[PDB]
Amino acid sequence: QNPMRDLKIEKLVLNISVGESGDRLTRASKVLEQLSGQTPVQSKARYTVRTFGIRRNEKIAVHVTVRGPKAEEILERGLKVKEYQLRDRNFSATGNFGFGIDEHIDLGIKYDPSIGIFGMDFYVVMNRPGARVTRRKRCKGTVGNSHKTTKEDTVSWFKQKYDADVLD
Amino acid sequence: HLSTYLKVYKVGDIVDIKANGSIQKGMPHKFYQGKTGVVYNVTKSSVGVIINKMVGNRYLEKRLNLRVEHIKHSKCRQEFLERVKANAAKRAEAKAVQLKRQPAQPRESRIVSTEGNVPQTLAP
Amino acid sequence: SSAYSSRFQTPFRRRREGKTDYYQRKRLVTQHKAKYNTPKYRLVVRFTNKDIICQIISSTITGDVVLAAAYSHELPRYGITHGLTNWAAAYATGLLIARRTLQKLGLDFKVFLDIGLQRTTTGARVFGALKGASDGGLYVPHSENRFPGWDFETEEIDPELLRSYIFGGHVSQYMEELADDDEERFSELFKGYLADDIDADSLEDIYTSAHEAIRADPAFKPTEKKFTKEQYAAESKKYRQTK
Amino acid sequence: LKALKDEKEEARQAKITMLKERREKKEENERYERLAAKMHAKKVERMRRREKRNKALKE
RNA sequence: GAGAACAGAAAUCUCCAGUAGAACAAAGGGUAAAAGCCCCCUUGAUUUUGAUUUUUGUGAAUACAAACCAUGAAAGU
RNA sequence: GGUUGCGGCCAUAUCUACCAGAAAGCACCGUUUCCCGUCCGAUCAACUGUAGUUAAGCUGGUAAGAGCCUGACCGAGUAGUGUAGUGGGCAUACGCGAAACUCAGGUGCUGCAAUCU
Numbered sequence: 172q173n174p175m176r177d178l179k180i181e182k183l184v185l186n187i188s189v190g191e192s193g194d195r196l197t198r199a200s201k202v203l204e205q206l207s208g209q210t211p212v213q214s215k216a217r218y219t220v221r222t223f224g225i226r227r228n229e230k231i232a233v234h235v236t237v238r239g240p241k242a243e244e245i246l247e248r249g250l251k252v253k254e255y256q257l258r259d260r261n262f263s264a265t266g267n268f269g270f271g272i273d274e275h276i277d278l279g280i281k282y283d284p285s286i287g288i289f290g291m292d293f294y295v296v297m298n299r300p301g302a303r304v305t306r307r308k309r310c311k312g313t314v315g316n317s318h319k320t321t322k323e324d325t326v327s328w329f330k331q332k333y334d335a336d337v338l339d
Numbered sequence: 340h341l342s343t344y345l346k347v348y349k350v351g352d353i354v355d356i357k358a359n360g361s362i363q364k365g366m367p368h369k370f371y372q373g374k375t376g377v378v379y380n381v382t383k384s385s386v387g388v389i390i391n392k393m394v395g396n397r398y399l400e401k402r403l404n405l406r407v408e409h410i411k412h413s414k415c416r417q418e419f420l421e422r423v424k425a426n427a428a429k430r431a432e433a434k435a436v437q438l439k440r441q442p443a444q445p446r447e448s449r450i451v452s453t454e455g456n457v458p459q460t461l462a463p
Numbered sequence: 464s465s466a467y468s469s470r471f472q473t474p475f476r477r478r479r480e481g482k483t484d485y486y487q488r489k490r491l492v493t494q495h496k497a498k499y500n501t502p503k504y505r506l507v508v509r510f511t512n513k514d515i516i517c518q519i520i521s522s523t524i525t526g527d528v529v530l531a532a533a534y535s536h537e538l539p540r541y542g543i544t545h546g547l548t549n550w551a552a553a554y555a556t557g558l559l560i561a562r563r564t565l566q567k568l569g570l571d572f573k574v575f576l577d578i579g580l581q582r583t584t585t586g587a588r589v590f591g592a593l594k595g596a597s598d599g600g601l602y603v604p605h606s607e608n609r610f611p612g613w614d615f616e617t618e619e620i621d622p623e624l625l626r627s628y629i630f631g632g633h634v635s636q637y638m639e640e641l642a643d644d645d646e647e648r649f650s651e652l653f654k655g656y657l658a659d660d661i662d663a664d665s666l667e668d669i670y671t672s673a674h675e676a677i678r679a680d681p682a683f684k685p686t687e688k689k690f691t692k693e694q695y696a697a698e699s700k701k702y703r704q705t706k
Numbered sequence: 707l708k709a710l711k712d713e714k715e716e717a718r719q720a721k722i723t724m725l726k727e728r729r730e731k732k733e734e735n736e737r738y739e740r741l742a743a744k745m746h747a748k749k750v751e752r753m754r755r756r757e758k759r760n761k762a763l764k765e
Numbered sequence: 766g767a768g769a770a771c772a773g774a775a776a777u778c779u780c781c782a783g784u785a786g787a788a789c790a791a792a793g794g795g796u797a798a799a800a801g802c803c804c805c806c807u808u809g810a811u812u813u814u815g816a817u818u819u820u821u822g823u824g825a826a827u828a829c830a831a832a833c834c835a836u837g838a839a840a841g842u
Numbered sequence: 843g844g845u846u847g848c849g850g851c852c853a854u855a856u857c858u859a860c861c862a863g864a865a866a867g868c869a870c871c872g873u874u875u876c877c878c879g880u881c882c883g884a885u886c887a888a889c890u891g892u893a894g895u896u897a898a899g900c901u902g903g904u905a906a907g908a909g910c911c912u913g914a915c916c917g918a919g920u921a922g923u924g925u926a927g928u929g930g931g932c933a934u935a936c937g938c939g940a941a942a943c944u945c946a947g948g949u950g951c952u953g954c955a956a957u958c959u
Contacts, residue, residue, distance in 0.1 A: 172897085173897080174894085174895065174896090174897065175870080175871085175894085175895050175896080175897045175898080176897040176898080177897095181884075182779095182882075182884070184769095184778060184779060185778090186769085186777060186778045186779090187777085188770095188771090188772075188776065188777040188778080189776095189777090190771095190772095190776085204881095207881085207882090209881060209882065210881055210882095211881060212881045212882095213881095214777055214778080215777095216776065216777085217776085217777090218765045218775085218776095219765060220775065220776060222775085222776095223772090223775085223776050224776090225776065227765075229776095231776065231777070232776080232777040232778080233777090234777070234778060234881085235881060235882080236778095236779095236881070236882050236884090237881095237882070238882060238883095238884065239882090260767095260768075260769095261768075261769070262767095262768075263767055263768040263769095263779080263780065263781090264766085264767045264768080264780085264781080265767075265768090265779095265780050265781055266780085267767095267768070267769095267779065267780055268768080268769090269768070269769040269778085269779075270769065270770080271769055271770030271771080271772095272770060273770050273771070274770095290770050290771065291770080292769050292770065292777085292778065293769075294768080294769055294778060294779050294780095295779085296779060296780065297780095299897075299898080300870060300871065300895085300897080300898080301869090301870050301871090301897075301898040301899065302870095302884085302898095303869090303870070303871090303884085303885090303899090304869085304870080304898075304899050304900095305899095306884065306885060307481075307885070307886095308481065308580055308798075308885080308886080309481045309482070309579075309580040309581075310480070310481045310482075310868095310869085310899085310900095311481040311798095312481075312898095312899055312900080313899085314898060314899075315897090315898060315899075316859085316860095317897080317898085318897065318898050318899090319781095320780095322767095340851095340852090341485065341488065341489060341492065341849090341850080342524055342850070342851080344489060344492065344493045345492065345522070345523060345524055345850095347496070347499045347500070348496075349499065360794065360795060361795070361796085362795090363795065363796090363800080365827075365828085367818080367827090368818080380816095380829095381496070381497050382497050382828070382829055382830090383495045383496060383497055383828095383829090384828070384829085385497075385828055385829075387817090387828095401817090401818075402816090402817065402818095403817060403818065403827090403828095404816085404817060404818090404827065404828045404829080405827095405828090406828090407496065464857095464908085464909095465908060465909065467783095467784085467857090468853095468856075468857060468908065468909045468910085469908095469909065469910085470784075471784060471853085471856070471857085471909090472784060472853095473784095473852075473853050473855080473856055473910095474784095474797095474852085475850095475851095475852055476851095476852065476853090476855065476950090477848090477849070477850095477852095478798090479855090479856085480900095481798085482847090482848090482849095483848080483849080484798065486798080486799080487840080488849090490839095490840060490841060490842085491839090491840055491841090492840095493840095493841090503840085505840080505848095507847075507848060509846095509847060509848085511846075511847085511867090511868065511869090512868075512869070512870095512871095512891080513867090513868090513891065514846085514867085514868095516846080516847055516848095516956090518847070518848070518955075518956095520847095520848055520849085520954085520955095521954095522848080522849065522850090523849090523850090523953090524850065524851095524953095525849090525850070525952095525953050525954080526848085526849040526850035526851085526952080526953045526954075527848055527849040527850080527953075527954060527955095528848095528849090528953080528954045528955085529847090529848070529954045529955035529956085530954090530955090531955090532847085532848095532954090532955050532956060533956095534847095534956075534957090536957090545890090546889085546890075546891095547891095548889090548890090548891090549888090549889070549890090550877090550888085550889095575839065575840045575841095576838075576839055576840080577839090577840085577848090578838080578839080578840095580798080581886090582878095582879095582886055582887080583837085583838060583839095584877075584878055584879080584886075584887055584888095585877055585878065585887090586876090586877030586878070586887075586888080587838090587877080587878090587887080587888095588888090589838090590838070593838080593839095603838095603839080604838085604839055604840080605838055605839065606837085606838055606839085607838095608837095608838065609838050610838095610877095611876090611877045611878090612877080613877090615878090624877095628876090628877080632876090633875075633876045633877080633888080633889085634876090634888095634889065634890090636875070636876070637874090637875045637876070637889070640875060641875080648873070648890095650892090651872080651873085651890080651892060651893065652872085652873070652889075652890045652891090652892060653890070653892080654890085654891095654892055655890090655891090655892080656890085656892095685956090686956085686957070688957085688958095689958095689959080690958080690959050692843080693843090694959060695843065695844075695865095695866090695958060695959055696843035696844085697843075697959095698843085698844090698864080698865075698958095698959050699843045699844045699845095699864095699865080699866090699958085699959080700843050700844090701843095701864080702844085702862090702863065702864060702865085703843065703844075703863090703902075704862070704863085704902050704903045704904095705902095705903080706903070706904090725944095746766095750774095752774085753774040753775090754774070754775085755774085756773095756774045756775075757774065757775050758775085759775085761791090762791090
């Protein structure tokens, strides 16, 4: 029985990790900006590595978060690229799931060699009503075991809506 | 420990010094620890305390200021005041004694019975 | 594990629940203490869903004491059934508790506001209750900064705007806009208001209503308390477990 | 005499064996936990070795 | 720890555990809605009057009142 | 007796697993014009308690559970120790006197105000 113990989507984070910093980052900027409607966030490097070719504080990625109907709409238009076929993995233990796409032009947006091509990673966090207890300030607490999301519940919800497969 | 702040300290009261590690401010006096002194003046933030410190073979008088967090009320005079009040009551009853203290006296005569307690003899 | 549990140091119970902040509490309760007894009084405002709380507390090693306490459920008696948690309603509750305490002290004193955990934001209902109390006449220290309509771009304030907020102007203009733009959300969010058919001038007059009423009798007409103690106790013990 | 002393020492030996059994079950599962933790620690410090990571400075 | 295209042990993203094992000028005390990181505003690291401890010489720290000030809604600092 | 708010003492309260919770409240939850802040009304800010839920949180019981606390004619008058002797080659005499461990028992107590079938 599930009157309020459903499994709604909470949010989707779309991320673009670039090998270099500059107008390439600004272009990936622009891509996620146009896809979401809102302004994205530029993420810097934590530490220098010198084999990936970067340094501390270099602005080496850009990402964005989306909540609401927009999130699942973009999710479906992206999963069309993966044609509704994920793996047994790509589902976390705690009940979240994500994938990655090359050739972002495979959802609506055209080639436009003005800018080039980028790939991006979708990650999608799931929950139920009542997550506010671990997110508010006053009254903070944690959620019970029975109400915890899980890989099995998410995979069943996914073999349900979007009507997909597991592929191994 | 908030009960270490709702603690009135009037001039005259006696207090022990026991500074806790949890407050870096005003950690006083390395060997003024477990030592007792009465309070002479009080300000905000503050209490006065005087101690008789001995140097050579005379007791000189060191006055000091301390945060309230380190000081503590002394239970030094509890039995003294209890005995004084009981002495007033006993003096009133006499007016209507050995109110003084006395060490442990030799226990007096008595009788020990054998009803169900027969003595149990034994050996090494 | 065993070692981690043993080396664990638990905080205070009231902190383990997200209920108090001893950092702020000590700065509040701690006195000058050159002056000895001089009990320090603090007005405690709290917001739950469906209800507001305003109290005036002294604290002592007994743990604390409540000389005066009011809530928003009293305001139906004073002329408003609706919107108990809003800005104007908390303002009314603050004026109520202020006139109450001033009556009991017989003067018409100095009380320090407790914010709790709520964030300090321009246009907050805690500052609405502050203005209600200062209305009532208790001298609390404050600044005109955080009242609404404070133009963040400079150091000035418009009194007419927070006057409208006291009278319930934002809810009224939103009522008007949502009404002349739609009726789905209107019928959903204003069912009692819809059955009552109240006006903007209306609702301002009702708040004036209630203001004069609390100025008339702030003496805490208490609840009627049906089904006295033993009834409640036995019926609750029917459903209380026991070892 | 041989009758008496052997039931008394046998009861005491039963107590001894129960004590020993109990202590050894507890320390056995404790040892298993610590050993798995040790192996996990060794496996993670095996892959951390590939990272250059001068521990001193700030990187 | 689990999880996400190129991306691997370390590039960025998300979730769970995590009393401190991190940081605060290397096995130690103290600090977790902080004494830590980020953000907002400032530059009380300011003058005058006396008091205490370390110490007869000062300096150091300490509390204490009046002013000019900063800060926060405030208690207060 | 239940609950809410403010607290005191700060694990007998904490951790883990399961279960129950009529009513009351609390809480999730509904919405985003304004006050406000967010990459993102998720947090924070505001509005109506209306759409609806005890699923969660919270409260209480349960476990030859972990830990935490109390006690022991528990250890034990033991170890250790002050004093004396032309005592032996460490005991005796007058005296003081533990802790760990083990075992047993327990698993929050309370103040102020308000409120509830």
